[PDB]
Amino acid sequence: KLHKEPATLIKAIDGDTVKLMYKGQPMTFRLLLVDTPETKHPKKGVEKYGPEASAFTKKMIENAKKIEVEFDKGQRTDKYGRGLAYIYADGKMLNEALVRQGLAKVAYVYKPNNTHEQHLRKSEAQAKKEKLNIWS
Secondary structure (H helix, E strand, O other): OOOOEEEEEEEEOOOOEEEEEEOOEEEEEEEOOEEOOOOOEOOOEOOOOHHHHHHHHHHHHHOOOOEEEEEOOOOOEOOOOOEEEEEEEOOEEHHHHHHHOOOOEEOOOOOOOOOOHHHHHHHHHHHHHOOOHHHO
């Protein structure tokens, strides 16, 4: 069973990457199961809705009372040393919020890090249907 643990903001980096203090150490987190358009894309640089996604994450995270991280059941870091987590701002999952607003797609999923996959697919379906942002 997953559980939430506390963390503190250091810096929002991008739509899908944030640096947090977690168990007393600065650590970079990559949001599980979502892909946002990027402003720091390694090959492309700045994509459409990149700035919008980055602004949404920034605002949501900087204005929260409480930030929690929730690891999935599998590997907890990727090959770049980033924590792979669901991030909650005042009990709302940022990963879901991005997908719901049409500012992220559901990623390619790597089992067993896929606990909230169905929930996120449902939000993406709704965003598509409403033609929000990426889907417009």
